[PDB]
TrEMBL record, chain A:
The keyword Transmembrane applies. The chain crosses the membrane at residues 27-48. Keywords: Membrane, Transmembrane, Transmembrane helix. This is Uncharacterized protein.
UniProtKB/TrEMBL annotation, chain B:
The chain crosses the membrane at residues 53-70. The keyword rRNA processing does not apply. This is NUVM protein. GO terms for molecular function: oxidoreductase activity. The gene is nuvm. Residues 1-19 are annotated as: Disordered.
Length: 83, 90
């Protein structure tokens, strides 16, 4: 279409047809940030990740159920289906 | 005879400042619309429609919520239940 547009206002998105001249140059910076962002984050998030299945033993969780029974018998609790 | 003293030398007031150029061509219809709106209460009266609205939202609607709130006061106790447990307290 290419209708005339008032070039006075400065928008954060650039405006109507932002085609600035050093786009070959400034893209060397932002992508240099972008890659430089991502690998910097991915290492930092690395010790915060974990494998879901198989983090502890079944023996630990079964002893936790044993501790549940020891707790619940001391409180004297009926089952969910007992009436 | 009784006029204030001659030692006043009073001057006319300014608003102080600059004539901003008028960035708005006001519509007299829109202006009298909004001026009709913001002083609605100075011409408000009682009709059947007024009475219908103030029947509902002033008396009937709070009485509906009062039938809700006091009758259902502390019934529900949704903390952790079981299949077969009562849900209310009454």
């Amino acid at each position: 279409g290419r209708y005339p547009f008032p070039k006075d206002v400065i928008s954060m998105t650039g405006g109507w047809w932002a085609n600035p001249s050093n786009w070959k140059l400034n893209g060397l910076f932002a992508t240099g940030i972008a890659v430089g962002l991502a690998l910097w984050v991915s290492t930092a998030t690395l010790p915060y990740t974990r494998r879901r299945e198989g983090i502890t033993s079944e023996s630990d969780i079964s002893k936790w159920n044993a501790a549940a029974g020891v707790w619940r018998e001391r409180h004297g609790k009926i089952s969910t289906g007992e009436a | 005879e009784l006029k204030p003293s001659s030692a006043i030398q009073r001057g006319p007031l300014n608003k102080g400042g600059w004539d901003a150029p008028h960035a708005l061509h006001n519509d007299g219809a829109i202006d009298r619309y909004a001026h009709w709106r913001t002083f609605y209460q100075e011409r408000f009266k009682y009709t059947r429609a007024t009475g219908k609205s103030t029947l509902i939202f002033l008396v009937a609607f709070p009485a509906l919520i009062g039938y809700v709130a006091y009758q259902s006061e502390g019934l529900f106790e949704f903390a952790g239940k079981r299949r077969g447990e009562s849900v209310t307290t009454r």
